[PDB]
Amino acid sequence: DDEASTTVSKTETSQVAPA
């Protein structure tokens, strides 16, 4: 949800892509 491109795939790196 935080990472514009992907909501499903929610990893630590996925969080990093916002902040």
XYZ file of C-alpha atoms in Angstrom:
19
model
C 0.000 0.000 0.000
C 2.793 2.534 0.858
C 4.779 1.682 -2.319
C 2.811 3.202 -5.262
C 3.863 0.481 -7.808
C 3.015 -2.537 -5.546
C 0.552 -3.168 -2.710
C 0.628 -7.029 -2.668
C 4.463 -7.419 -2.522
C 5.087 -5.641 0.786
C 8.725 -6.090 1.843
C 11.262 -3.935 3.759
C 12.679 -2.736 0.379
C 9.068 -2.010 -0.711
C 8.816 0.351 2.354
C 12.206 1.948 1.480
C 10.925 2.968 -2.015
C 8.684 5.619 -0.344
C 11.148 6.255 2.554
